[PDB]
């Protein structure tokens, strides 16, 4: 019953327009382009949607229009977190109104929540989400809650629970997870480790760099299933030397402004306080995409 | 034109109701019960209003309200930040028509930004903000933001910057932005040092625990202005034998259950996901309610 | 000229009579057993070995006893760092004396020290051990040393440097370093993601779980050479089922007292301030050392 | 029978001579220096005194030194702390024989080891010091050792345990700890926040710059008796003056380099890895070395 949520979706950016508005037909012809790469399903609302810089009738928004395109196509999981149970909440019924498969929250953050705090509000999440499953994260880098291993089991045995995103570079943990919980849909959220990975337990993943190089990662997961070791490492080599700019660059802005040079998005900018993309980067971004476009 | 800002201003909580809508009468009557304790202002919108479990519109009517009770009456503070820039314009602009004496922003957290991103952040809400001073601050605990010295030197030197919220326990940073700046007006963050962070350099505070005890902080102001070391010392004990207390129950809920005991707030409760109070807590705190009211 | 560097090889353990002195007889038998596991090497003196709580003098027995058992049977790498230069040069110059393939220096820790301060440090004790190759290290978790990609390849780059200890479970820096060092000799040293470690980069490994179970970590080695993803993956979780219980019962002595149930070990202490194994773990403890005997 | 232990008390350098060995009569004159400036104790061996890069033969050598200077003149406390804790009760015992009038010892290090197992170093140590006091650190910044309240409290109450040196910037739990422990022996550890760390709770303090301008810190005890507000404070952002110019050049060495040009001492170098003191610092130090003088 959750086994549909198996695989490698990317985080879904959210495209702006020149003036900080959602651009609507620049999203949605990126939801069609990750489709056309062949993904499992994809990530709506995430941090790498910056959700974070948007309202929630905004991120409603967002959610419908993916929907529109995407439903029965791919899975869809919509990230409904907030800090705010209620907000969450209403974010998770408008998931379910729309058809999404699952919905996701991020660990509250911010203020200091107690471990039983976090579990009452993922219930309070899933009882809005009306019968569709939960994503838990475990996520300590961006939202500082750093989480033991017996808290995450009683997370993902949470009812509803039907996956776990786990955003951490620890491999150990990965490894625990995936031994206390064989059958765990559990994603890989770091995607300058994902071969290693997976092969310490993840069995798919979510991250924001599959939006402009989905079939290197598949390729992986492929490569493992195969036994191509080699084939493995020099795709997450190809991977990382991509990562690398995006950091120097600037992630999600590099990646749109990627998105931008292979004709899918009109306009590359993030809201502010992102700054844009600096001119000196420029050559090597649509170097890039030219040489990602030819790949395929 | 910005030593009015100088003083001791309670962090205000912002009441809900039963149903965790805003309890609008009885912010009116916090307001009034600050201003009758004696504070050189009110900090309206921080983290301890709640604000990250707010909407922008919610977080106006709280800025609109407070106006209405304090202007020129007591110093009014906004704080507008956001992660959004464009977010914390609009709370800016709508402070600025409400007449509020200052903005603030918490350094936009959640995601990485460089610091001329930061600045350019609050260069922004500065131009929204109409020509009153910026209190910018340093906050690293709970915003995961760790700003250098140099750094706080460039920010306290924007121009439209009029003070620092100093948030951080580090009292040789305290000393240094003194010795840099002897005329900042820089406020203590954390309650529990406000004696030994005013002995280090702050001419001021703004703190939480200031709504149910502010004349114990004003007490503290004046000891050691007189030379009275033994009852600045005395102060702080009891001040941290309340921290301590709150600190057990969640600081938060029960700051306003001790409001409520002294009839200033009509229900006590935090938003989700914030716990209510266990039961186990009650005899204390309204114990403490008695002992700070007698006290008066 | 550092080729023969590559492999897995075990940390070894000191061990000690029953009144925390050096056990030079059962040193002897755990080197012997250790060449009987099929390792490459062994590594001498480190933190695994109780180093830090070993005098100099004791530091150069263990070493010439164990360069008297291996010498021109398996690779010798003499950890030979202290907090002290000139510490480290005496057991440098031992371990030349002795016959060492290598030495090893952690970086020096406790007091800050600046990155060109760590570069000399190595310099100098590159140049008392008269021409065998140094061992780095990256370890940030032990010392508290937290070194930057850049830093790295300095490191490796210092004349007499022929491979790099990476004690860190970053496995992004692992592919890094790989990337930009493809002929570097690279060791895992977080035995509990050793198949991810080498998935990312790493061609082989420094462990102190290895002195119980070298022959597993040699086959995760060849079962990814081999393309058994699910080899590798299966050996791994047995090595962590083995990990998880020697955290629980703490390490070092765990891993003494398994190896007094194989017999090799006459007495199963670590030096105080290490308390003895609580008794309530013996029969976990006994059991695993003749799991692991069968399995041979 | 502790109260002798309370006050100012400078933690000694150990002179070198210009080969790294001891500087014996360099030791002496510092600490006839010492006394000269009207302090209440030396503590001998610490991390200041480079311990950690010393033997033990010579730390004992050190302690014998001092204490046949000292000794029925000035409070003597000889740090005895290394990771072993045979050897820490080695350095206790001597300790004992000289005529300390206490031991101290830092939280064993580089290892991860239990509550219990520090609390048994402890008690290990002070049977081995045979009746003088003990006294326990908090420091977590250089020792990676992070300490709850609670556990504090059952330290200051081992049997033996006359002192507590409190090497923490967090002025709530030295407030704490004060309040919980009324008449404990509280030694404020950061020199940069002596004066709030006094107002805090601290009767004293165990520093290494009081080598420098002891007075200074003698004079802001006696200022925050006499009600002297502005003079603790002005008197601590002149030490904060001079403590932003050793960080930059290096706390050892910028303290043994004014002790030089002070005439106390031959020889100014810290012992490898140390770089000597940069020449572009050496006018700044020597006008500091005047200064100072001159203050006297
Ligand atoms: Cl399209
Ligand atoms: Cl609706
Ligand atoms: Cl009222
Ligand atoms: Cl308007
Ligand atoms: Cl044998
Ligand atoms: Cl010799
Ligand atoms: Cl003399
Ligand atoms: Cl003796
Ligand atoms: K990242
Ligand atoms: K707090
Ligand atoms: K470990
Ligand atoms: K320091």
């Given at each position: 019953?959750?086994?549909?949520?198996?695989?490698?979706?990317?985080?879904?950016?959210?495209?702006?327009?020149?003036?900080?508005?959602?651009?609507?037909?620049?999203?949605?012809?990126?939801?069609?382009?990750?489709?056309?790469?062949?993904?499992?399903?994809?990530?709506?609302?995430?941090?790498?949607?910056?959700?974070?810089?948007?309202?929630?009738?905004?991120?409603?928004?967002?959610l419908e229009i993916?929907?529109?395109?995407?439903?029965?196509?791919?899975?869809?999981?919509?990230?409904?977190?907030?800090?705010?149970?209620?907000?969450?909440?209403?974010?998770?019924?408008?998931?379910?109104?729309?058809?999404?498969?699952?919905?996701?929250?991020?660990?509250?953050?911010?203020?200091?929540?107690?471990?039983?705090?976090?579990?009452?509000?993922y219930r309070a999440?899933?009882?809005?989400?009306?019968?569709?499953?939960?994503?838990?994260?475990?996520?300590?880098?961006?939202?500082?809650?750093?989480?033991?291993?017996?808290?995450?089991?009683?997370?993902?045995?949470?009812?509803?629970?039907?996956a776990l995103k786990?955003?951490?570079?620890?491999?150990?943990?990965?490894?625990?997870?995936?031994?206390?919980?064989?059958?765990?849909?559990?994603?890989?959220?770091?995607?300058?480790?994902?071969?290693?990975?997976?092969?310490?337990?993840?069995?798919?993943?979510?991250?924001?760099?599959?939006?402009?190089?989905?079939?290197?990662?598949?390729?992986?997961?492929?490569?493992?299933?195969?036994?191509?070791?080699?084939?493995?490492?020099?795709?997450?080599?190809?991977?990382?030397?991509?990562?690398?700019?995006?950091?120097?660059?600037?992630?999600?802005?590099?990646?749109?402004?990627?998105?931008?040079?292979?004709?899918?998005?009109?306009?590359?900018?993030?809201?502010?306080?992102?700054?844009?993309?600096?001119?000196?980067?420029?050559?090597?971004?649509?170097?890039?995409?030219?040489?990602?476009?030819?790949?395929?």
């Amino acid at each position: 019953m959750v086994s549909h949520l198996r695989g490698v979706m990317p985080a879904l950016l959210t495209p702006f327009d020149a003036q900080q508005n959602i651009d609507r037909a620049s999203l949605r012809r990126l939801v069609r382009f990750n489709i056309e790469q062949g993904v499992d399903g994809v990530y709506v609302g995430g941090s790498t949607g910056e959700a974070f810089v948007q309202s929630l009738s905004e991120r409603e928004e967002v959610l419908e229009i993916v929907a529109e395109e995407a439903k029965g196509k791919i899975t869809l999981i919509a990230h409904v977190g907030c800090v705010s149970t209620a907000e969450s909440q209403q974010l998770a019924a408008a998931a379910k109104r729309y058809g999404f498969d699952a919905v996701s929250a991020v660990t509250p953050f911010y203020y200091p929540f107690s471990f039983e705090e976090h579990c009452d509000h993922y219930r309070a999440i899933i009882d809005s989400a009306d019968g569709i499953p939960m994503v838990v994260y475990n996520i300590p880098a961006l939202s500082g809650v750093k989480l033991t291993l017996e808290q995450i089991n009683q997370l993902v045995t949470l009812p509803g629970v039907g996956a776990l995103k786990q955003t951490s570079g620890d491999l150990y943990q990965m490894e625990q997870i995936r031994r206390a919980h064989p059958e765990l849909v559990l994603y890989n959220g770091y995607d300058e480790i994902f071969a290693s990975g997976l092969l310490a337990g993840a069995d798919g993943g979510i991250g924001s760099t599959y939006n402009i190089m989905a079939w290197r990662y598949l390729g992986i997961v492929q490569a493992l299933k195969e036994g191509d070791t080699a084939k493995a490492q020099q795709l997450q080599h190809e991977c990382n030397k991509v990562i690398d700019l995006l950091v120097k660059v600037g992630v999600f802005r590099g990646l749109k402004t990627v998105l931008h040079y292979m004709d899918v998005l009109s306009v590359p900018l993030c809201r502010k306080p992102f700054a844009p993309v600096e001119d000196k980067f420029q050559a090597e971004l649509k170097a890039l995409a030219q040489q990602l476009m030819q790949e395929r």
